[PDB]
Amino acid sequence: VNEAFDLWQECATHCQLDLSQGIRSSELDLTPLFETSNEEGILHYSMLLGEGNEGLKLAIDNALTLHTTHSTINFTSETAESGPRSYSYIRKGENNWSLNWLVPVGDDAPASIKIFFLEQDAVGLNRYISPIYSIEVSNNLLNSLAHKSTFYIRAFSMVNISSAGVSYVAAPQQHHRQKRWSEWHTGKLLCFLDPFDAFYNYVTQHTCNPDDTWEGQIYRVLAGNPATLDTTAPSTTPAVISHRIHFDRGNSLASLTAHQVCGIPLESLARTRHPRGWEELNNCGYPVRNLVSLFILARLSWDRVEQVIHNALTNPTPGNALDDAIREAPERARVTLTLAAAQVNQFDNQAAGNTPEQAQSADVVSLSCSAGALHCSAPADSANALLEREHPNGANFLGAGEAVSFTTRGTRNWSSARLNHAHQQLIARGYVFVGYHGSSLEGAQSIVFGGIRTRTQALDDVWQGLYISGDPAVAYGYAQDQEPDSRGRIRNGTMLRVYVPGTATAYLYETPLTLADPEAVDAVGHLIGHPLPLQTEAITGPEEAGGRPATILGWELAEQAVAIPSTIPTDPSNIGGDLDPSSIPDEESDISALPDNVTKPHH
Ligand SMILES: [Mg+2]
């Protein structure tokens, strides 16, 4: 009796909802107020739960069910095809919290909903956020949640609901489809929603980039009276935001790897509503994902990727699909499988329970790292996920111009003027030039558009990291394919410039000892104040005895470094040749002053 209520009328402002007579339900009917026909954008459903928000069962249709206690918010969600999926959030707050869900609208829009909990301080200001949970659901649920759904609430006695309603923001149609939804699977999602932009700024100390986060799109209420203005606690301190991404297809590791190799937004490799086939996906995205899948099907150790590639190129099994896939694009296979192997090793080391094989289908957790902070600590509840740290990369610093791409005939759309502008933007953001990195065309695409990240390397564990040099002639030797293809051919590659955040300048060390020399290991340990390997440090020294300098960035520093293209071309007439110092533009030499490296330990 009197089960029914009207959330968007009675609880728009405030309602004390009676739970004493058993279950309460409200139709959330959007059909009168919003026609999803010819709309592309985001529905943001929210309500604030006050006193009596503990010991409740909440539901949206039969699709999403939440259980609340004082210390936890637990939920189970339906998925498109993989069956139900359960998450437990340990509360960071003790007072009110908002239930938020995002429903993307449009035939071309993403095939995931977002769920997240914003916890307030004692005085009712937004202070803490849960992980952003991304669930790939059926086309039917995506459509229904944008039309009519029912909200159920039950105790086991009343609950204070306020600011119940729904808002909408249209996707910007001036940006092509890939770019348009690029931040759907990042913490910058919060920058799409007017009430949370400043929350993101205060918690991450990163910009809400106008051109990447829909700035200027009108965020408007459709029903009820939801929170639209910022009410962020002014005392909010920096903290890592986590975005947990479920892949219904079970191909998370392959999709993550394709994102990192190709520099393609992770959303583009997610579930599609209707079979898509973007030019960037058919050329790089799908083939790279497919190579990881074929490697998994071969049942080979991730420790052996470089020997599997070598074997495929020099002593292949004819008609073996993995060998043939490697042979088609060997250098892409090197970048692809050494990235996936590093991700699998990192996953394995996150928990005793974790196995290489659980990595294949694990959720991705995207971490919004705090600007400048040298360490980006993962939340405890991310230990069962594939971690990717969001740091600015080269693509954020290319500035205005046509699309930059890497070819044997040279870097496209990359003038001295564009480099000077990029350099100026980097030093204005406190980044410091540390040297040149030579890579393959595919290596450059990955590092610039995907970001620098750990790859497995055939070398001593203690000397692992990104190998660069202050001397562009050293880098130049690596600015080509790492090994020949199946016909014994090597392509020229790309010269890159590498910049570290200014926060790392005290950890840029130098020794007269030879890098990668077993006899230098204890002396380098003494210099950096702990045994190798390098963490958030770099070491500079002779490449070989008496030789030219090189620099190793520890992988944890390298992740935070930015690579942009050099205007030093690779000469395709003289593949394997020495750098002609006459091919170095004076405008580049002028911006290439190197740091004052630390030569004695701090203590
Ligand atoms: Mg915004």
Residue numbers in the entry: 1 to 156, 163 to 609
Give the exact sentences the study uses for this entry.
Pseudomonas aeruginosa can also secrete a mART toxin, known as exotoxin A (PE), but with an organization of its three functional domains (receptor, translocation, and enzymatic elements) that is opposite to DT. All these PLTs were composed of a single-chain amino acids that folded into three distinct structures: a receptor binding domain I, a translocation domain II, and a catalytic toxin domain III. Cytotoxicity associated with this family of toxins is due to their enzymatic activity and the ADP-ribosylation of eEF2. Our analysis of four of these new members by X-ray crystallography presents the defining three-domain structure typical of this family, despite substantial variability in the amino acid sequences of these proteins.
